[PDB]
Specification:
EC number: 3.6.5.-
Radius of gyration: 29 Å
Number of strands: 28
GO cellular component, one term: cytosol
Helix content: 10-25%
Shape: elongated
Subunit structure: Monomer.
Protein name: Large ribosomal subunit assembly factor BipA
Bound molecules: phosphomethylphosphonic acid guanylate ester
Distance between the termini: 57 Å
CATH architecture of one domain: 3-Layer(aba) Sandwich
Number of helices: 13
Structural class: alpha+beta
CATH topology of one domain: Rossmann fold
Subcellular location: Cytoplasm
CATH superfamily of one domain: P-loop containing nucleotide triphosphate hydrolases
Largest sheet: 7 strands, antiparallel
Protein backbone atom coordinates (compact mmCIF):
# COMPACT_ATOMS: atom_id res chain seq x y z
CA UNK A 1 0.00 0.00 0.00
CA UNK A 2 2.90 2.46 0.87
CA UNK A 3 4.06 3.12 -2.66
CA UNK A 4 0.94 5.02 -3.80
CA UNK A 5 0.76 7.54 -0.88
CA UNK A 6 1.03 11.29 -1.60
CA UNK A 7 1.65 14.02 0.99
CA UNK A 8 1.67 17.71 -0.04
CA UNK A 9 1.22 21.25 1.30
CA UNK A 10 -0.77 24.11 -0.37
CA UNK A 11 -0.09 27.84 -0.66
CA UNK A 12 -2.49 30.69 -1.41
CA UNK A 13 -3.07 34.16 0.08
CA UNK A 14 -5.18 37.30 -0.20
CA UNK A 15 -6.13 35.79 -3.56
CA UNK A 16 -9.44 33.92 -3.39
CA UNK A 17 -7.86 31.24 -5.57
CA UNK A 18 -6.79 28.88 -2.80
CA UNK A 19 -9.47 26.20 -2.40
CA UNK A 20 -11.72 26.44 -4.13
CA UNK A 21 -9.16 23.86 -5.29
CA UNK A 22 -9.64 21.61 -2.26
CA UNK A 23 -13.43 21.85 -2.57
CA UNK A 24 -12.98 21.52 -6.33
CA UNK A 25 -11.05 18.25 -6.17
CA UNK A 26 -14.39 16.63 -5.27
CA UNK A 27 -13.58 13.89 -7.90
CA UNK A 28 -12.33 11.82 -4.91
CA UNK A 29 -14.11 9.26 -2.67
CA UNK A 30 -17.86 9.48 -3.38
CA UNK A 31 -18.59 5.77 -2.93
CA UNK A 32 -15.36 10.35 16.48
CA UNK A 33 -15.80 13.07 13.86
CA UNK A 34 -13.70 16.17 14.54
CA UNK A 35 -11.54 17.91 13.92
CA UNK A 36 -10.49 18.40 10.30
CA UNK A 37 -8.56 19.84 8.77
CA UNK A 38 -5.98 19.09 7.83
CA UNK A 39 -5.85 17.91 5.24
CA UNK A 40 -8.40 16.97 2.58
CA UNK A 41 -7.16 13.46 1.83
CA UNK A 42 -8.74 12.79 -1.56
CA UNK A 43 -8.63 9.41 -3.33
CA UNK A 44 -7.75 9.42 -7.10
CA UNK A 45 -7.44 6.17 -9.06
CA UNK A 46 -8.58 6.56 -12.72
CA UNK A 47 -5.38 2.67 -8.25
CA UNK A 48 -6.32 4.02 -4.80
CA UNK A 49 -3.93 6.93 -4.55
CA UNK A 50 -4.26 8.34 -1.06
CA UNK A 51 -3.47 12.08 -1.32
CA UNK A 52 -3.08 14.05 1.92
CA UNK A 53 -3.16 17.67 0.75
CA UNK A 54 -2.15 19.02 4.19
CA UNK A 55 -2.99 22.68 4.72
CA UNK A 56 -0.45 25.42 5.35
CA UNK A 57 -1.05 28.60 7.36
CA UNK A 58 -0.75 31.81 5.28
CA UNK A 59 -0.82 33.27 8.79
CA UNK A 60 2.88 33.59 9.88
CA UNK A 61 2.69 32.58 13.59
CA UNK A 62 5.10 32.21 16.57
CA UNK A 63 5.66 27.12 12.47
CA UNK A 64 5.14 26.09 8.85
CA UNK A 65 8.26 23.87 8.87
CA UNK A 66 6.30 21.83 11.42
CA UNK A 67 3.73 21.14 8.68
CA UNK A 68 6.19 20.39 5.86
CA UNK A 69 8.26 18.04 8.00
CA UNK A 70 5.28 15.74 7.14
CA UNK A 71 4.76 16.40 3.39
CA UNK A 72 6.93 15.40 0.40
CA UNK A 73 6.12 18.06 -2.26
CA UNK A 74 3.94 21.19 -2.43
CA UNK A 75 1.12 22.89 -4.37
CA UNK A 76 1.82 26.57 -4.85
CA UNK A 77 -1.40 28.09 -6.16
CA UNK A 78 -1.47 31.50 -7.80
CA UNK A 79 -4.08 33.57 -9.64
CA UNK A 80 -3.36 34.49 -13.24
CA UNK A 81 -4.32 38.21 -12.97
CA UNK A 82 -2.01 39.44 -10.22
CA UNK A 83 0.94 37.08 -9.53
CA UNK A 84 2.47 35.51 -6.43
CA UNK A 85 1.94 37.65 -3.31
CA UNK A 86 4.17 38.59 -0.33
CA UNK A 87 3.23 35.63 1.94
CA UNK A 88 2.75 33.10 -0.73
CA UNK A 89 6.40 34.30 -0.42
CA UNK A 90 7.46 33.55 3.21
CA UNK A 91 5.68 30.14 3.30
CA UNK A 92 7.40 28.69 0.27
CA UNK A 93 10.91 29.50 1.63
CA UNK A 94 10.51 26.85 4.25
CA UNK A 95 9.40 24.51 1.42
CA UNK A 96 12.76 24.73 -0.32
CA UNK A 97 14.54 24.57 3.08
CA UNK A 98 13.29 20.96 3.24
CA UNK A 99 13.84 18.75 0.16
CA UNK A 100 10.49 19.81 -1.42
CA UNK A 101 9.64 19.95 -5.12
CA UNK A 102 6.73 22.46 -5.76
CA UNK A 103 3.90 21.84 -8.10
CA UNK A 104 2.88 25.23 -9.44
CA UNK A 105 -0.82 25.73 -10.21
CA UNK A 106 -2.32 28.74 -11.95
CA UNK A 107 -5.86 29.48 -10.82
CA UNK A 108 -8.71 31.54 -12.30
CA UNK A 109 -7.58 31.62 -15.89
CA UNK A 110 -11.33 32.13 -16.56
CA UNK A 111 -10.66 35.78 -15.55
CA UNK A 112 -10.82 38.43 -18.36
CA UNK A 113 -7.47 40.22 -17.74
CA UNK A 114 -5.55 36.94 -17.75
CA UNK A 115 -1.73 36.96 -17.67
CA UNK A 116 -1.21 33.18 -17.62
CA UNK A 117 2.30 33.38 -19.09
CA UNK A 118 3.49 36.58 -17.36
CA UNK A 119 2.54 35.06 -13.95
CA UNK A 120 4.83 32.05 -14.56
CA UNK A 121 7.58 34.48 -15.59
CA UNK A 122 6.85 36.38 -12.35
CA UNK A 123 6.97 33.19 -10.27
CA UNK A 124 10.63 32.38 -11.23
CA UNK A 125 11.81 35.96 -10.64
CA UNK A 126 10.26 35.86 -7.14
CA UNK A 127 10.46 32.10 -6.64
CA UNK A 128 13.68 31.15 -8.41
CA UNK A 129 15.78 33.67 -6.49
CA UNK A 130 15.60 31.15 -3.65
CA UNK A 131 17.78 28.42 -5.14
CA UNK A 132 16.91 24.73 -4.79
CA UNK A 133 18.63 24.17 -6.99
CA UNK A 134 16.47 21.62 -8.81
CA UNK A 135 13.12 22.85 -10.15
CA UNK A 136 13.53 24.00 -12.72
CA UNK A 137 10.77 21.39 -12.73
CA UNK A 138 8.69 22.81 -11.41
CA UNK A 139 6.81 21.19 -14.30
CA UNK A 140 4.55 20.83 -12.72
CA UNK A 141 3.07 24.34 -13.50
CA UNK A 142 -0.54 23.20 -14.10
CA UNK A 143 -3.28 25.49 -15.34
CA UNK A 144 -6.68 25.53 -13.67
CA UNK A 145 -10.08 27.07 -13.13
CA UNK A 146 -11.77 26.29 -9.78
CA UNK A 147 -14.98 27.16 -11.60
CA UNK A 148 -14.58 23.87 -13.48
CA UNK A 149 -8.74 28.48 -23.53
CA UNK A 150 -4.98 28.43 -24.09
CA UNK A 151 -1.70 27.09 -22.72
CA UNK A 152 -1.79 23.60 -21.22
CA UNK A 153 -3.27 21.41 -22.28
CA UNK A 154 -5.93 21.99 -23.10
CA UNK A 155 -7.85 20.77 -21.38
CA UNK A 156 -9.89 17.59 -20.91
CA UNK A 157 -11.49 18.51 -17.58
CA UNK A 158 -8.82 20.72 -16.02
CA UNK A 159 -9.25 18.71 -12.82
CA UNK A 160 -8.87 15.35 -14.54
CA UNK A 161 -5.21 16.02 -15.30
CA UNK A 162 -4.24 17.64 -11.99
CA UNK A 163 -4.46 14.27 -10.24
CA UNK A 164 -1.92 12.82 -12.67
CA UNK A 165 0.41 15.78 -12.10
CA UNK A 166 0.47 15.20 -8.32
CA UNK A 167 1.03 11.43 -8.65
CA UNK A 168 3.76 11.84 -11.33
CA UNK A 169 5.96 14.47 -9.61
CA UNK A 170 5.27 14.07 -5.88
CA UNK A 171 7.25 11.09 -4.55
CA UNK A 172 6.23 8.38 -2.10
CA UNK A 173 6.97 9.11 1.62
CA UNK A 174 10.46 7.59 2.21
CA UNK A 175 9.68 5.69 5.41
CA UNK A 176 9.85 1.95 6.26
CA UNK A 177 6.87 -0.21 7.44
CA UNK A 178 8.89 -3.12 8.78
CA UNK A 179 10.80 -2.97 12.06
CA UNK A 180 8.99 -1.52 15.11
CA UNK A 181 6.78 1.65 15.16
CA UNK A 182 7.86 5.29 15.48
CA UNK A 183 6.35 8.73 14.68
CA UNK A 184 7.44 12.34 15.19
CA UNK A 185 4.67 14.55 16.48
CA UNK A 186 4.86 17.28 13.82
CA UNK A 187 1.61 19.30 14.12
CA UNK A 188 -0.46 19.53 17.32
CA UNK A 189 -4.04 20.27 18.44
CA UNK A 190 -6.05 20.23 21.69
CA UNK A 191 -9.54 19.56 22.93
CA UNK A 192 -10.72 19.92 26.53
CA UNK A 193 -12.37 16.45 26.43
CA UNK A 194 -9.52 14.30 24.85
CA UNK A 195 -6.40 16.23 25.91
CA UNK A 196 -3.70 17.08 23.41
CA UNK A 197 -3.68 15.24 20.14
CA UNK A 198 -0.61 14.06 18.25
CA UNK A 199 -0.87 14.75 14.53
CA UNK A 200 2.30 13.54 12.87
CA UNK A 201 3.27 11.53 9.85
CA UNK A 202 4.31 7.93 10.63
CA UNK A 203 8.06 7.31 10.27
CA UNK A 204 7.93 3.49 10.68
CA UNK A 205 5.65 0.61 11.78
CA UNK A 206 1.97 0.34 12.69
CA UNK A 207 -0.40 1.34 15.60
CA UNK A 208 -3.75 0.28 17.14
CA UNK A 209 -5.93 2.19 19.73
CA UNK A 210 -4.59 0.12 22.74
CA UNK A 211 -0.89 -0.93 23.05
CA UNK A 212 2.04 0.77 24.74
CA UNK A 213 4.55 3.35 23.43
CA UNK A 214 7.23 5.78 24.76
CA UNK A 215 7.96 9.56 24.43
CA UNK A 216 11.37 11.02 23.48
CA UNK A 217 13.95 13.29 25.05
CA UNK A 218 14.04 11.64 28.46
CA UNK A 219 11.63 8.95 29.94
CA UNK A 220 7.89 9.03 28.84
CA UNK A 221 6.07 5.71 29.23
CA UNK A 222 2.33 6.56 28.77
CA UNK A 223 -0.32 4.94 26.49
CA UNK A 224 -3.53 6.42 24.95
CA UNK A 225 -6.93 4.86 24.06
CA UNK A 226 -7.80 6.25 20.55
CA UNK A 227 -6.40 7.18 17.05
CA UNK A 228 -8.16 9.61 14.74
CA UNK A 229 -6.85 9.98 11.16
CA UNK A 230 -7.59 11.96 8.03
CA UNK A 231 -10.04 10.61 5.36
CA UNK A 232 -11.56 12.98 2.81
CA UNK A 233 -12.37 16.19 4.64
CA UNK A 234 -13.09 14.03 7.76
CA UNK A 235 -10.75 13.06 10.65
CA UNK A 236 -12.23 9.65 11.46
CA UNK A 237 -10.98 6.76 13.73
CA UNK A 238 -10.18 3.13 12.81
CA UNK A 239 -8.87 -0.32 13.99
CA UNK A 240 -5.25 0.64 13.27
CA UNK A 241 -2.89 2.84 11.18
CA UNK A 242 0.29 1.53 9.53
CA UNK A 243 2.86 3.50 7.56
CA UNK A 244 3.32 6.97 6.14
CA UNK A 245 -0.18 8.38 6.79
CA UNK A 246 -0.66 11.81 8.37
CA UNK A 247 -2.50 10.10 11.30
CA UNK A 248 -3.29 11.72 14.70
CA UNK A 249 -3.17 10.38 18.26
CA UNK A 250 -4.99 11.29 21.52
CA UNK A 251 -4.37 11.17 25.29
CA UNK A 252 -0.57 10.77 25.67
CA UNK A 253 1.67 12.30 28.44
CA UNK A 254 2.11 16.59 27.92
CA UNK A 255 2.57 15.49 24.30
CA UNK A 256 4.73 18.01 22.37
CA UNK A 257 6.03 19.28 19.05
CA UNK A 258 9.35 17.79 17.75
CA UNK A 259 8.95 15.16 20.48
CA UNK A 260 8.71 11.63 18.92
CA UNK A 261 6.77 8.45 19.75
CA UNK A 262 8.02 4.88 19.32
CA UNK A 263 7.52 1.32 20.56
CA UNK A 264 9.08 0.21 23.85
CA UNK A 265 10.73 -2.88 22.37
CA UNK A 266 13.87 -2.04 20.39
CA UNK A 267 13.11 1.52 19.29
CA UNK A 268 14.01 5.18 19.77
CA UNK A 269 14.44 7.57 18.42
CA UNK A 270 13.88 10.45 15.99
CA UNK A 271 15.88 13.60 15.32
CA UNK A 272 14.95 17.00 13.88
CA UNK A 273 14.54 20.03 16.14
CA UNK A 274 14.65 21.89 13.99
CA UNK A 275 15.45 25.31 15.47
CA UNK A 276 12.21 26.43 17.13
CA UNK A 277 13.11 24.40 20.22
CA UNK A 278 13.08 26.27 23.52
CA UNK A 279 16.04 27.36 25.69
CA UNK A 280 14.42 28.09 29.10
CA UNK A 281 11.86 26.48 31.41
CA UNK A 282 10.18 27.89 34.49
CA UNK A 283 7.67 25.85 36.44
CA UNK A 284 4.07 27.00 36.54
CA UNK A 285 2.27 25.98 39.72
CA UNK A 286 -1.13 26.72 41.13
CA UNK A 287 -1.15 29.54 43.62
CA UNK A 288 -0.71 27.77 46.97
CA UNK A 289 -0.43 31.11 48.82
CA UNK A 290 -2.80 32.36 51.56
CA UNK A 291 -4.56 34.57 48.99
CA UNK A 292 -5.52 31.50 46.89
CA UNK A 293 -8.16 32.73 44.43
CA UNK A 294 -8.69 36.00 46.36
CA UNK A 295 -7.85 38.31 43.42
CA UNK A 296 -8.43 36.08 40.34
CA UNK A 297 -11.05 33.96 38.68
CA UNK A 298 -9.24 30.95 37.26
CA UNK A 299 -6.89 29.08 39.56
CA UNK A 300 -7.54 25.29 39.88
CA UNK A 301 -4.79 23.36 38.02
CA UNK A 302 -7.21 21.87 35.54
CA UNK A 303 -7.87 25.41 34.20
CA UNK A 304 -4.17 26.36 34.06
CA UNK A 305 -3.31 23.24 32.05
CA UNK A 306 -6.40 23.79 29.83
CA UNK A 307 -5.03 27.27 29.10
CA UNK A 308 -1.45 25.97 28.63
CA UNK A 309 -2.60 23.53 25.99
CA UNK A 310 -4.77 26.13 24.29
CA UNK A 311 -1.43 27.99 23.93
CA UNK A 312 0.38 24.79 22.79
CA UNK A 313 -1.53 24.67 19.55
CA UNK A 314 -0.72 27.99 17.79
CA UNK A 315 2.38 28.95 19.88
CA UNK A 316 5.27 26.89 18.49
CA UNK A 317 8.34 27.77 20.58
CA UNK A 318 6.34 26.58 23.64
CA UNK A 319 6.70 23.08 25.06
CA UNK A 320 4.79 22.19 28.30
CA UNK A 321 5.09 19.05 30.45
CA UNK A 322 3.99 17.58 33.78
CA UNK A 323 5.87 16.87 37.02
CA UNK A 324 5.69 14.59 40.03
CA UNK A 325 3.56 17.34 41.66
CA UNK A 326 -0.07 17.53 40.51
CA UNK A 327 -0.23 21.33 40.49
CA UNK A 328 3.10 22.05 38.72
CA UNK A 329 4.15 22.35 35.04
CA UNK A 330 7.54 22.76 33.33
CA UNK A 331 6.70 25.47 30.81
CA UNK A 332 9.59 25.80 28.35
CA UNK A 333 9.96 28.68 25.81
CA UNK A 334 12.43 30.21 23.32
CA UNK A 335 13.19 33.03 25.77
CA UNK A 336 12.37 34.44 29.18
CA UNK A 337 10.07 36.94 27.37
CA UNK A 338 8.38 34.18 25.36
CA UNK A 339 7.03 32.87 28.69
CA UNK A 340 6.37 36.19 30.45
CA UNK A 341 3.94 37.20 27.63
CA UNK A 342 2.04 33.96 28.43
CA UNK A 343 2.03 34.89 32.12
CA UNK A 344 1.12 38.59 31.62
CA UNK A 345 -1.76 37.41 29.38
CA UNK A 346 -3.00 34.63 31.70
CA UNK A 347 -2.89 37.39 34.31
CA UNK A 348 -5.01 39.76 32.19
CA UNK A 349 -7.46 36.90 31.48
CA UNK A 350 -8.10 36.29 35.23
CA UNK A 351 -5.54 33.55 36.18
CA UNK A 352 -3.65 32.92 39.37
CA UNK A 353 -0.40 31.00 39.32
CA UNK A 354 3.01 30.79 41.00
CA UNK A 355 6.12 30.60 38.77
CA UNK A 356 9.67 29.30 39.40
CA UNK A 357 12.94 31.00 38.37
CA UNK A 358 13.65 30.61 34.66
CA UNK A 359 16.25 27.88 34.66
CA UNK A 360 17.87 27.36 31.26
CA UNK A 361 17.62 24.20 29.15
CA UNK A 362 21.03 22.56 29.31
CA UNK A 363 21.45 20.26 26.25
CA UNK A 364 23.77 17.40 25.46
CA UNK A 365 25.50 18.07 22.11
CA UNK A 366 28.46 15.87 21.06
CA UNK A 367 29.77 14.68 24.44
CA UNK A 368 30.00 18.30 25.61
CA UNK A 369 26.95 19.60 27.46
CA UNK A 370 26.07 23.00 26.02
CA UNK A 371 24.05 25.91 27.43
CA UNK A 372 22.33 28.63 25.40
CA UNK A 373 24.23 31.89 24.83
CA UNK A 374 22.66 35.13 23.48
CA UNK A 375 23.62 38.15 21.38
CA UNK A 376 23.19 41.17 23.61
CA UNK A 377 23.06 44.72 22.30
CA UNK A 378 22.89 47.83 24.47
CA UNK A 379 23.27 51.66 24.20
CA UNK A 380 24.35 53.79 27.18
CA UNK A 381 25.79 57.12 28.25
CA UNK A 382 29.57 57.34 28.77
CA UNK A 383 29.18 57.39 32.60
CA UNK A 384 27.65 53.87 32.48
CA UNK A 385 30.54 51.84 30.97
CA UNK A 386 32.12 51.92 34.44
CA UNK A 387 29.00 50.13 35.66
CA UNK A 388 28.13 47.86 32.64
CA UNK A 389 31.78 46.73 32.50
CA UNK A 390 31.56 44.86 35.76
CA UNK A 391 28.04 43.43 35.45
CA UNK A 392 28.30 41.58 32.18
CA UNK A 393 31.85 40.59 33.08
CA UNK A 394 30.46 39.12 36.32
CA UNK A 395 27.93 37.18 34.19
CA UNK A 396 30.50 35.81 31.70
CA UNK A 397 29.75 38.44 29.05
CA UNK A 398 32.27 37.97 26.24
CA UNK A 399 32.55 41.46 24.77
CA UNK A 400 32.19 41.63 20.96
CA UNK A 401 32.21 45.37 20.06
CA UNK A 402 32.19 49.13 20.83
CA UNK A 403 30.59 51.72 18.51
CA UNK A 404 31.17 55.06 20.32
CA UNK A 405 28.76 57.45 18.51
CA UNK A 406 30.96 60.58 18.86
CA UNK A 407 28.86 62.39 21.48
CA UNK A 408 28.49 60.95 25.02
CA UNK A 409 26.86 57.63 24.15
CA UNK A 410 28.31 54.26 23.06
CA UNK A 411 26.76 50.96 21.86
CA UNK A 412 28.01 47.58 23.14
CA UNK A 413 27.39 44.16 21.60
CA UNK A 414 28.16 41.01 23.63
CA UNK A 415 27.63 37.33 23.90
CA UNK A 416 26.37 36.01 27.29
CA UNK A 417 25.10 32.62 28.47
CA UNK A 418 21.33 32.96 28.84
CA UNK A 419 21.90 31.73 32.41
CA UNK A 420 23.85 34.96 33.07
CA UNK A 421 21.39 37.34 31.34
CA UNK A 422 18.69 36.39 33.87
CA UNK A 423 18.73 39.22 36.35
CA UNK A 424 20.56 41.85 34.37
CA UNK A 425 17.86 44.15 32.92
CA UNK A 426 16.84 45.58 36.32
CA UNK A 427 20.48 46.54 37.01
CA UNK A 428 21.08 48.17 33.56
CA UNK A 429 18.08 50.34 34.53
CA UNK A 430 19.33 50.80 38.15
CA UNK A 431 22.88 51.73 36.89
CA UNK A 432 21.85 54.01 34.00
CA UNK A 433 18.79 55.54 35.77
CA UNK A 434 16.38 54.29 33.04
CA UNK A 435 18.52 55.89 30.29
CA UNK A 436 20.00 52.50 29.41
CA UNK A 437 18.45 50.77 26.45
CA UNK A 438 18.77 47.01 25.93
CA UNK A 439 17.32 44.00 24.21
CA UNK A 440 18.98 40.77 23.17
CA UNK A 441 18.39 37.57 21.19
CA UNK A 442 19.15 33.83 21.19
CA UNK A 443 22.25 33.00 19.16
CA UNK A 444 23.53 29.48 19.86
CA UNK A 445 24.14 26.46 22.08
CA UNK A 446 27.85 26.28 22.95
CA UNK A 447 29.81 24.60 25.74
CA UNK A 448 28.92 25.60 29.30
CA UNK A 449 30.88 28.04 31.46
CA UNK A 450 29.98 26.44 33.62
CA UNK A 451 30.35 27.79 37.16
CA UNK A 452 27.46 29.86 38.48
CA UNK A 453 26.72 33.42 37.39
CA UNK A 454 22.97 33.95 37.73
CA UNK A 455 23.23 34.39 41.49
CA UNK A 456 21.88 37.25 43.60
CA UNK A 457 24.43 38.84 45.97
CA UNK A 458 21.70 39.63 48.56
CA UNK A 459 19.09 37.95 50.74
CA UNK A 460 15.37 38.65 51.21
CA UNK A 461 13.16 39.99 53.97
CA UNK A 462 10.19 37.72 54.81
CA UNK A 463 7.17 38.33 57.08
CA UNK A 464 6.22 35.64 59.63
CA UNK A 465 2.46 36.31 59.92
CA UNK A 466 -0.58 37.60 57.99
CA UNK A 467 -1.81 41.06 58.80
CA UNK A 468 -1.12 44.54 57.53
CA UNK A 469 2.03 46.61 57.25
CA UNK A 470 2.53 48.69 60.38
CA UNK A 471 4.42 51.90 59.42
CA UNK A 472 5.90 51.79 62.98
CA UNK A 473 7.54 48.45 61.99
CA UNK A 474 8.48 49.31 58.38
CA UNK A 475 10.12 52.69 59.18
CA UNK A 476 12.64 50.53 61.12
CA UNK A 477 12.87 47.70 58.57
CA UNK A 478 14.06 49.86 55.61
CA UNK A 479 17.11 50.60 57.82
CA UNK A 480 18.12 46.89 57.47
CA UNK A 481 17.29 46.65 53.72
CA UNK A 482 15.52 47.89 50.59
CA UNK A 483 11.70 47.66 50.76
CA UNK A 484 8.93 46.30 48.43
CA UNK A 485 5.84 47.74 50.27
CA UNK A 486 4.86 50.70 52.49
CA UNK A 487 1.90 52.24 54.33
CA UNK A 488 -0.25 49.20 55.25
CA UNK A 489 -0.77 46.40 52.68
CA UNK A 490 -2.28 42.91 53.26
CA UNK A 491 0.56 40.29 53.50
CA UNK A 492 1.22 36.76 54.85
CA UNK A 493 3.78 34.33 56.35
CA UNK A 494 6.14 33.19 53.63
CA UNK A 495 5.72 36.47 51.69
CA UNK A 496 8.88 38.33 50.61
CA UNK A 497 8.76 42.05 51.32
CA UNK A 498 12.21 43.46 50.43
CA UNK A 499 15.93 42.79 50.06
CA UNK A 500 18.44 42.57 52.93
CA UNK A 501 21.61 44.62 52.29
CA UNK A 502 23.75 41.45 52.92
CA UNK A 503 23.18 37.75 51.90
CA UNK A 504 21.39 36.16 54.89
CA UNK A 505 17.56 35.92 54.87
CA UNK A 506 15.81 37.66 57.80
CA UNK A 507 12.33 36.39 58.72
CA UNK A 508 11.18 39.63 60.37
CA UNK A 509 7.74 40.56 61.67
CA UNK A 510 5.43 43.04 59.94
CA UNK A 511 2.62 42.68 62.48
CA UNK A 512 2.14 44.64 65.70
CA UNK A 513 5.22 46.79 66.25
CA UNK A 514 4.64 47.21 69.00
CA UNK A 515 4.00 49.51 70.56
CA UNK A 516 6.50 50.06 73.37
CA UNK A 517 5.75 48.62 76.80
CA UNK A 518 3.77 48.94 78.83
CA UNK A 519 8.28 59.17 56.39
CA UNK A 520 8.54 55.83 54.48
CA UNK A 521 10.71 55.35 51.37
CA UNK A 522 8.75 54.87 48.13
CA UNK A 523 8.92 51.04 47.55
CA UNK A 524 10.19 49.09 44.51
CA UNK A 525 7.80 48.73 41.56
CA UNK A 526 8.47 45.01 40.86
CA UNK A 527 7.04 44.29 37.38
CA UNK A 528 6.22 40.66 36.42
CA UNK A 529 9.18 40.93 34.14
CA UNK A 530 11.56 41.72 37.03
CA UNK A 531 10.02 39.58 39.80
CA UNK A 532 11.02 36.62 37.59
CA UNK A 533 14.52 37.97 37.02
CA UNK A 534 14.55 38.52 40.85
CA UNK A 535 13.67 35.13 42.37
CA UNK A 536 15.77 32.10 43.51
CA UNK A 537 15.12 28.27 43.42
CA UNK A 538 13.60 28.51 46.89
CA UNK A 539 11.18 31.33 45.82
CA UNK A 540 8.02 31.67 43.66
CA UNK A 541 6.24 34.58 41.94
CA UNK A 542 2.53 34.41 42.71
CA UNK A 543 0.55 36.47 40.19
CA UNK A 544 -2.99 37.72 40.24
CA UNK A 545 -4.64 39.78 37.51
CA UNK A 546 -4.27 42.80 39.82
CA UNK A 547 -1.05 42.05 41.76
CA UNK A 548 2.50 40.65 41.76
CA UNK A 549 3.57 38.77 44.85
CA UNK A 550 6.86 37.10 45.69
CA UNK A 551 7.11 34.31 48.29
CA UNK A 552 9.33 31.48 49.48
CA UNK A 553 8.54 27.96 48.10
CA UNK A 554 8.13 26.66 51.61
CA UNK A 555 6.63 29.22 53.99
CA UNK A 556 7.15 28.06 57.57
CA UNK A 557 10.82 28.69 58.33
CA UNK A 558 11.18 25.39 60.19
CA UNK A 559 9.60 23.67 57.19
CA UNK A 560 12.09 25.29 54.81
CA UNK A 561 15.08 24.39 56.97
CA UNK A 562 13.89 20.78 57.20
CA UNK A 563 14.73 20.55 53.50
CA UNK A 564 18.02 22.44 53.53
CA UNK A 565 19.67 20.68 55.05
CA UNK A 566 20.57 19.04 51.73
CA UNK A 567 20.92 15.22 51.23
N1 LIG B 1 -13.38 33.36 -12.48
C1 LIG B 1 -12.88 32.52 -11.54
N2 LIG B 1 -13.00 32.88 -10.23
C2 LIG B 1 -12.52 32.09 -9.23
C3 LIG B 1 -11.86 30.82 -9.58
N3 LIG B 1 -11.49 30.25 -8.44
C4 LIG B 1 -11.87 31.06 -7.44
N4 LIG B 1 -12.48 32.17 -7.90
C5 LIG B 1 -13.04 33.30 -7.12
O1 LIG B 1 -12.49 33.40 -5.81
C6 LIG B 1 -13.45 33.06 -4.83
C7 LIG B 1 -13.19 31.64 -4.41
O2 LIG B 1 -13.65 31.46 -3.09
P1 LIG B 1 -12.70 30.94 -1.91
O3 LIG B 1 -12.72 29.44 -1.94
O4 LIG B 1 -13.18 31.63 -0.66
O5 LIG B 1 -11.20 31.40 -2.24
P2 LIG B 1 -10.12 31.16 -1.08
O6 LIG B 1 -8.74 31.09 -1.61
O7 LIG B 1 -10.43 29.78 -0.31
C8 LIG B 1 -10.24 32.54 0.08
P3 LIG B 1 -9.12 32.19 1.44
O8 LIG B 1 -7.81 32.79 1.10
O9 LIG B 1 -9.77 32.87 2.76
O10 LIG B 1 -8.95 30.60 1.67
C9 LIG B 1 -14.82 33.21 -5.46
O11 LIG B 1 -15.36 34.48 -5.09
C10 LIG B 1 -14.55 33.10 -6.95
O12 LIG B 1 -15.27 34.07 -7.71
C11 LIG B 1 -11.77 30.48 -11.02
O13 LIG B 1 -11.22 29.42 -11.38
N5 LIG B 1 -12.28 31.35 -11.91
Amino acid sequence: MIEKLRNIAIIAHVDHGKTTLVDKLLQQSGTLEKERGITILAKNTANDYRINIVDTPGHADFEVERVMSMVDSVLLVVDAFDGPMPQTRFVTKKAFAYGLKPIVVINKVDRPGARPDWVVDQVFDLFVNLDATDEQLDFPIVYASALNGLDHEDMAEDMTPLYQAIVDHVPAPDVDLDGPFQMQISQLDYNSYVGVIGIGRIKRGKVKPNQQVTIIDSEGKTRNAKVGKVLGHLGLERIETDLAEAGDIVAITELNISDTVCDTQNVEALPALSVDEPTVSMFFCVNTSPFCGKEGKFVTSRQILDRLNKELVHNVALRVEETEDADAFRVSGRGELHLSVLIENMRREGFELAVSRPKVIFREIDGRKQEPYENVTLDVEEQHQGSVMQALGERKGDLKNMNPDGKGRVRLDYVIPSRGLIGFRSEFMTMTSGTGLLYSTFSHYDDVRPGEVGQRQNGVLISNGQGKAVAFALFGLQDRGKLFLGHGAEVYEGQIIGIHSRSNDLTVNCLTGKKLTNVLVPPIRMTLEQALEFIDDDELVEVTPTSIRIRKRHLTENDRRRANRAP
